[PDB]
Symmetry: D2
Subunit: 293 residues, 4 copies
């Protein structure tokens, strides 16, 4: 009837290691991840995988060569583009700029809000593709990519990037009552046990987040949203298949790296949920950005 991306089962407890808690050793991997993706934040996805640290270190080591490439840059960008395309076609997204002005937001402040949205509009596809690699590698045991056709695919990615500062994020333990209820609403509506970095950064401006989320919420899990989400997911799987450097990181690789059988089961649930989440997050950020046009 319409394409619907099924949410996986996750009973595993999720234990993200935030940047402000990461020890020196973890922080160096975090630094490399941000420098390579060219983003100023470590994804909650990668924070959660990092709990299984030796797996995280090895999976990053193996994925990183592909992430440095022209191919990966383009594949990520094309997902941003597809999202923009879908949401523009399927939804009448009224602009919120006048409404924000009426609330008292100045031109500069709205500019700052846009800039925060741009960070995630750029970065999230990269996280989506990485999460997809981690999940599919664990589930299938397959070796992905490394076909090396067009030589330009292996060229270095477009070199510029913003890696500082970490965006201002209102963590759950920072948050007061009213903000906690918006977080609760987002969690329930999106079927997640965590608050994404994106929403926490928007929450630097609580009345903006309330507005932006309130306009998005009715679109969630409409047929068009759901079909679009499925499409974004398919794009991410297609990118995994075309990685310029082969990626393999199976259960046995996880065991080799020092995970137990039980941790590996747990990790599979954790990454599956994050991977599913990420196609939705891409569409959501696109919606926010188009609202603020």
């Amino acid at each position: 009837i319409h394409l619907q991306l099924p949410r996986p089962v996750c009973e595993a407890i999720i234990r993200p290691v935030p940047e402000h808690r990461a020890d020196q050793e973890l922080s160096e991997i975090y630094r490399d991840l941000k420098a390579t993706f060219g983003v100023p934040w470590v994804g909650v996805i990668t924070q959660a995988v990092a709990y299984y640290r030796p797996f995280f270190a090895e999976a990053w080591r193996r994925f990183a060569p592909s992430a440095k490439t022209h191919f990966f840059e383009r594949a990520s960008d094309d997902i941003r583009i597809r999202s923009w395309e879908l949401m523009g076609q399927s939804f009448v997204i009224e602009g919120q700029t006048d409404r924000l002005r009426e609330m008292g937001y100045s031109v500069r402040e709205i500019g700052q809000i846009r800039a925060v949205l741009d960070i995630f509009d750029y970065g999230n596809p990269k996280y989506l593709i990485f999460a997809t690699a981690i999940k599919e590698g664990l589930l299938s045991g397959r070796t992905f990519g490394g076909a090396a056709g067009d030589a330009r695919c292996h060229f270095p990615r477009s070199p510029i990037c913003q890696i500082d500062p970490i965006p201002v994020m209102v963590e759950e333990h920072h948050a007061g009552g009213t903000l906690s209820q918006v977080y609760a609403d987002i969690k329930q509506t999106l079927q997640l046990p965590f608050i994404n970095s994106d929403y926490k950064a928007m929450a630097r401006w609580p009345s903006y987040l309330e507005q932006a989320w309130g306009a998005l919420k009715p679109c969630i899990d409409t047929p068009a949203y759901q079909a679009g989400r499925f499409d974004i997911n398919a794009r991410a799987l297609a990118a995994l298949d075309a990685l310029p450097t082969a990626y393999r990181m199976s259960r046995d690789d996880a065991l080799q790296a020092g995970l137990s059988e039980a941790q590996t089961d747990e990790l599979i649930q954790v990454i599956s949920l994050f991977q599913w989440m990420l196609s939705g997050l891409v569409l959501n950020v696109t919606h926010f950005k188009q609202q603020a046009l």
Copy 2:
């Protein structure tokens, strides 16, 4: 029975021009103020005076030579020191670092909170002395300072400073729900129609502000707080008398700058309230800082 600083009458509307709204010309004055004070934010006191822009520009022009001096640095610093001294002596201020940890705050986060408190602990004395200059100059029509004394008083101040970026502040139009309630509580308790930059910056961590304000609130307008406040105000007055470069900015000077009689009356009420406010703010930040030791 004990020294207490009378709150002036202000029925005039306060119209601060925030840094995110200031036009090009005002922003240049704002930049010079920050560079000269050595602080990363424009005070709400100076924002409110800036509404009367030709007065603000001429008053800053006349005060700036003094603010650049070794004297001003030392006099401001001595007010910080006096405040530290008074609050230490008069109150049993229990450390809140353990509670913050229990609430989920990391070592790095608590460090960031302290850094924010330091900005205001350093800068507020300077704003206090300036507001005192503006108020007394208008009320008295007197010429303050300019005495030949110790040549070293005219030397450049301690040269290092911190002027970027503007602290993250949760503006009233940013706030939602419970933060506005905390803001309401602060306004009513401190008898102010506005929220200070200091509390808007603490509000970056709403649960921290709630704790810090809760611990401070019972101290407000105890005899010891009030007597301390009076002493801080007295130091401010003494500093004005010893400015190394003479400052005069009377009603007549205000009229010559292009203010109307009615604007000058309004400005007098406005500055009087801020001047009064600032002795209290200094004690409050000291309290926060000692809590967070």
Copy 3:
């Protein structure tokens, strides 16, 4: 295949960012923000002397600059340059030699990051320079076709616009540094020193090294062919601008320039436009050295 240097008797008058007044600095900021780069090119500094033309040219060009199309066409020039220099030249790695000179791993990383700025940014300036020159010379209207709707989408968001890279300006320069600059000017046939070399000059012994290895490649047959190819890419980009660009001699008059000033501008932009195809190759060479 060969790009002949144009004739330029006109004096070039860059307005550096550290001298630009408030109004001009606002246009400079917008340029940087849109291109997503931390520096104002000497190309745009020189055109800024003709301020009413500069402001209107930017006004007309900026809508295209903000697009996916522009991001991709600029990126494809960088890719092509990488491809050409890789195939056409044996470019020996210089990292070992840098280390032997006392450069640490972190310093070499810093040097690479400076190179990446220009590697990214120069194609954008090249296309803009091409737009200005051909607009003036031909009076034609370039681009503006609907075509693929995605071409008009906003470009890939993220950018680095601060700080301005540390540049050793000519009046900063001492004796031997002035001599490297003179050599560069002579060899490249330019009356000015590019931002690229000035930034490299923050590490004088590094600049000498890198320029040293590049210099014998300049104006070899393969370099010239490569340069011709890069120029052709810039012209193709201009023909496919998603938003129409027209800015003729007559438009220059309407913007506030006199006829004589327009004629001078034409000489100035022609020199810079020619220069930029070569700068792209040169930075690509530096970058491959530093691999």
Copy 4:
């Protein structure tokens, strides 16, 4: 009054910030954050070679460094230097000549901000160097008296620590810059180039100018006398440290150094401690030139 240069056979082995490993970098960071300065002095880079001693000495000195007393005593040294150079020399302004060389208002602003960094921080390094040296030479316990309780209060909090100043390192330098560096070494009797001159060297023509104006003042009678005075202030600051500092030869042994390594350290710190009184005067001179 005169201040003799100590004998120093020892090789000085600074560990620069761009080479420091993770462990040392954390001490460097705490040093900068406590002093409130954006660079790690060469004094501390050299002592860092004796890392077990450096870590313990800093551990012992840091509680004093954090205080109101230390902020004031350091500041009073800056003031005294300002005072002395003002009285003892006719220092001609150089802003006009810099402008005439092509420096803009903003560039001269940037130059002044760099000088301010060292004007602020060098007295702190001087006092620390004096503590290390005298601790080792005398074996005494310095300070630790209660006295005025305000002396133990935390220092004026605000600080600029964030970007390391751009410094043209000796291996960055080529040609004529290496000559100016050699002149500085010979004139000041040092085997190294201070962070302050390396930062001024970001503008090579400015450094030549500023050094050229200072040089005839070096080791005149009024300069030597002022230097002696600055040294004596540092010694007084040490005697009044709010928290006791003891770090003897025996402490050096307990910290992990051998006896021979301690003998060498004593030579190294003695040379730096002597250098620092001179550096304070020099930066004061630069700063008054640039008014």
